[PDB]
Ligand binder design. Structure first.
Ligand SMILES: Cc1cc2nc3c(=O)[nH]c(=O)nc-3n(C[C@H](O)[C@H](O)[C@H](O)COP(=O)(O)O)c2cc1C
Ligand SMILES: O=C(N[C@@H]1CCCc2c1cnn2-c1ccccc1F)c1onc2ccccc12
Ligand SMILES: CCCCCCCCCC[N+](C)(C)[O-]
Ligand SMILES: O=C1C[C@@H](C(=O)O)NC(=O)N1
Ligand SMILES: [Cl-]
Ligand SMILES: [Cl-]
Ligand SMILES: [Cl-]
Length: 367
């Protein structure tokens, strides 16, 4: 049973490594091991119940790795090996940039949470382009086999024209991606989340979509917008409106939160940055629920924020997500968490009378 690796990781290896390594070192080591395929056995075999068709693609299972883990596209193949149904790399900025000073990442173990203020540390588009080009046909085969690749695009700290930074990303990495994400929801770049005062969001996304439409057909990715959990009701209404009007392909709901929910215990709760993990979970699920309603269920949503179990995944799917991602849970529980979530989700689907993931998408809105 896989529960062996799961328990060993969760109860012994992971807490040991947490005591030995600072969180940024732990991130770097996890990326390096993953990149080399040095992974526990992923004992879980994906069943047909977990397959999802969305965004022009087959997804063998609906559990992805969220942006921010493999920022620079170094570990994509090991992430599939780990059992993820899809991988999102980035955020990638046009020019290389260092990000914020260290320390810039903090664990809140008591809360099963993380706070980060990386500030879009990125190798930049050219480096990532060449890295993805080196495995482009391997990725075409993976995609055809139900294992798509997403690329999350960011902007540089000193850029004078945000829309131009995103357009550069679409031109350079769009041809190498199944989907692109216009991340206008980092907490850690000044001005970024403001990329929604309405006619200006419309202006940005129109430029992005024009650049995407200009790519040759087999190199033309889906375009998604990733939003924060901190938006006003007005901002959410506005985003829904623009997405419908422009024919944006989907939404990623959500990025980290700049809020600090009552009840956090970790000593580092008042560090600046975005909060992820358990305390974000229900805020994210509620944002999914509202965006699904505002878009009439016609816009695919990738649900993200605090997923650590099959129940967490199913709640997001029933709220409206077609796919989910996780990050922070991997940091606490290690690679076995991926099989755990998938096994649990399959069991819950059966118990609740769903034929598969597809049948559960948005199920709460139909009761
Ligand atoms: C250390 C860290 C770095 C991240 N960097 C990125 C990023 O570069 N781009 C992005 O869109 N989201 C970034 N995120 C946000 C995650 O993609 C995700 O939306 C969020 O952490 C919620 O999921 P989780 O609770 O499962 O971690 C980052 C998250 C963490 C924890
Ligand atoms: O704690 C982190 N990694 C743990 C510790 C190092 C080893 C590791 C982790 C998660 N899988 N794994 C791992 C990956 C491949 C093979 C064996 C492993 F054991 C971590 O990784 N990304 C982060 C970002 C923010 C804060 C902490 C972060
Ligand atoms: C970060 C330290 C923990 C790393 C765990 C290494 C497991 C690699 C598994 C290799 N093996 C062929 C036995 O599966
Ligand atoms: O979009 C992002 C970017 C990131 C960063 O600080 O690099 N941190 C986040 O939490 N979300
Ligand atoms: Cl093993
Ligand atoms: Cl409000
Ligand atoms: Cl405090």
């Amino acid at each position: 049973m896989a529960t062996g690796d799961e328990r060993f990781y969760a109860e012994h290896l992971m807490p040991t490594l947490q005591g030995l390594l600072d969180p940024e070192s732990a991130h770097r080591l996890a990326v390096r091991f993953t990149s080399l395929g040095l992974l526990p056995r992923a004992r879980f075999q994906d069943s047909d119940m977990l397959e999802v068709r969305v965004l022009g693609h087959k997804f063998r299972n609906p559990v992805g790795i969220a942006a921010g883990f493999d920022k620079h596209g170094e570990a994509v193949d090991g992430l599939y090996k780990m059992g993820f149904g899809f991988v999102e790399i980035g955020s990638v900025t046009p020019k290389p940039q260092e990000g914020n000073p260290r320390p810039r990442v903090f664990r809140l173990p008591e809360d099963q949470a993380v706070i980060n203020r990386y500030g879009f540390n990125s190798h930049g588009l050219s480096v990532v382009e060449h890295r993805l080009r080196a495995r482009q046909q391997k990725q075409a085969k993976l995609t055809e086999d139900g294992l798509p690749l997403g690329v999350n695009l960011g902007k540089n700290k000193t850029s004078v024209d945000a829309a131009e930074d995103y357009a550069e990303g679409v031109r350079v990495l769009g041809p190498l991606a199944d989907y692109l994400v216009v991340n206008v929801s980092s907490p850690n770049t000044a001005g970024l989340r403001s990329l929604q005062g309405k006619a200006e969001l419309r202006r940005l996304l129109t430029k992005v979509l024009q650049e995407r439409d200009g790519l040759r057909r087999v190199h033309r990715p889906a375009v998604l917008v990733k939003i924060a959990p901190d938006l006003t009701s007005q901002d959410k209404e506005d985003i829904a409106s623009v997405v419908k009007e422009l024919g944006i392909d989907g939404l990623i709901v959500t990025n980290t939160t700049v809020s600090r929910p009552a009840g956090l215990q970790g000593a580092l709760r008042s560090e600046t940055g975005g909060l992820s993990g358990k305390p974000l979970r229900d805020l994210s699920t509620q944002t999914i629920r509202e965006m699904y309603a505002l878009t009439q269920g016609r816009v695919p949503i990738i649900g993200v924020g605090g997923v650590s179990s099959g129940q967490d995944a199913l709640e997001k799917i029933r709220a409206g997500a077609s796919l989910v991602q996780l990050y922070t849970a991997l940091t606490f529980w290690g690679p076995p968490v991926v099989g755990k979530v998938k096994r649990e989700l399959e069991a819950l689907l059966k118990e609740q009378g769903f034929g598969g993931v597809t049948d559960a998408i948005g199920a709460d809105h139909r009761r």
